[PDB]
């Protein structure tokens, strides 16, 4: 129970459905635990407070 210093491991995240017409098929994907993000290229918080 403590905050890690060295970097960890990731699935990693991947983008998928966005537009107003999909027609998906559900083929493949990862049975392994993964992560899927809706918006492309987010993670915006560049301010560092010393």
């Amino acid at each position: 129970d403590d905050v890690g210093i060295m970097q960890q491991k990731k699935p990693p995240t991947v983008v998928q459905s966005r537009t107003d017409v999909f027609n998906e098929q559900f083929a493949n994907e990862a049975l392994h635990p993964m992560t899927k993000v809706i918006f492309n290229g987010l993670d915006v918080n560049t301010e560092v407070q010393p």
Partner: peptide
């Protein structure tokens, strides 16, 4: 140092055929 890793080990087993000795023990 940089990335946290993982290693593996297995307890080893060492044996030779019973050697011959020329020295006696008891009377």
């Amino acid at each position: 140092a940089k990335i946290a890793t993982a290693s593996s080990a297995r307890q080893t087993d060492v044996e030779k055929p019973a050697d011959v000795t020329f020295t006696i023990e008891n009377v």
